[PDB]
Amino acid sequence: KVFGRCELAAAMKRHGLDNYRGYSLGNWVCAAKFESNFNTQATNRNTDGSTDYGILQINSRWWCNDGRTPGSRNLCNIPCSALLSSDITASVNCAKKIVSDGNGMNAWVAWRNRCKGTDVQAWIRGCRL
């Protein structure tokens, strides 16, 4: 599923991401735009041989099981394929664990490099939330 911007903003807010660990909804929408372009089916291989899955490009090195990431963990206790669903519940639940891990949203390098410190409220502009 390719989400619309406000469509994804509504879904993330319904699932309790607005101001989760102090991060406003536009931070999460901005992260999703630059991680996945709002595409639930996005997959990208990392140089370490792990893979990033779904709207928030959650990494198989730590968070989900894909069966092909030697020495990796599965801290969200989910198959990485569950992160590609049109229903973002699994991605959001797993994202809440990631952002709680100590470094907040710096875990998402695209958030740090492209969203952090920017006018992220622009990403929810015009949305009926």
Alpha helices in 15-120 (DSSP H): 25-36, 89-99, 109-110
Among 72, 92, 105, 123, indicate the residue that binds Na ion (CB under 5 A).
72
48 is in an annotated binding site: no
* In contact, 31 and 111? CB cutoff 8 Å: yes
For 21, phi and psi rounded to 5 degrees?
50, 30
Q: Return the SS3 of 125.
A: coil
Beta-carbon count within 10 A of 26 CB: 21
Nearest-approach distance from CB 35 to Na ion, in angstroms: 18
Q: How far is the CB of 53 from Na ion (least distance, A)?
A: 10
Site track for Na ion across 23-62, x = CB under 5 A: -------------------------------------x--
How does strand 43-45 pair with strand 58-59? unpaired
Closer residue to Na ion in complex, CB, 24/65: 65
Q: Which residues have a catalytic role annotated?
A: 35, 52
Instruction: Please identify which residue in 27, 51, 59, 69 interacts with Na ion, judged by CB under 5 A.
Output: 69
Three-state secondary structure call for residue 23: strand
As annotated, the binding site for substrate includes 101
Binding site for Na ion (CB under 5 A): 60, 65, 69, 72, 74
